[PDB]
Write a structure and sequence with these properties.
mainly beta; two-stranded antiparallel sheet; Magnaporthe oryzae; monomer; unknown function
Length: 89
């Protein structure tokens, strides 16, 4: 799966964030994806190949103790901008 979450081709359609619920210390894994692709994510070292269907993955592939946040790449972009405010006044 994605080694780094930092990948901004500006081509992506979807964005899925994996937040470890058992681990508050761990950083959320933000993965950018396209419309209906597979999403290989290694949780606890275990690869889960999730099926995306319109920015919506299969919760059935998701282990317990992990929050999977679903969004579009566009929503992700808007949210990072709105939360970090990388642009200057």
């Amino acid at each position: 799966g994605p080694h780094m979450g930092k990948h901004g081709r500006d081509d992506y359609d979807c964005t899925v964030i994996f937040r470890n619920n058992h681990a508050p210390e761990r950083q959320p894994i933000v993965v950018h994806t396209y419309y209906s692709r597979d999403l290989p994510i290694e949780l606890d070292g275990v690869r889960h190949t999730i099926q995306l269907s319109g920015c919506t993955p299969e919760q059935s592939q998701i282990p317990q103790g992990y929050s999977v946040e679903h969004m579009t790449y566009k929503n992700y972009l808007r949210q990072e901008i709105l939360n970090e405010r990388p642009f200057w006044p």
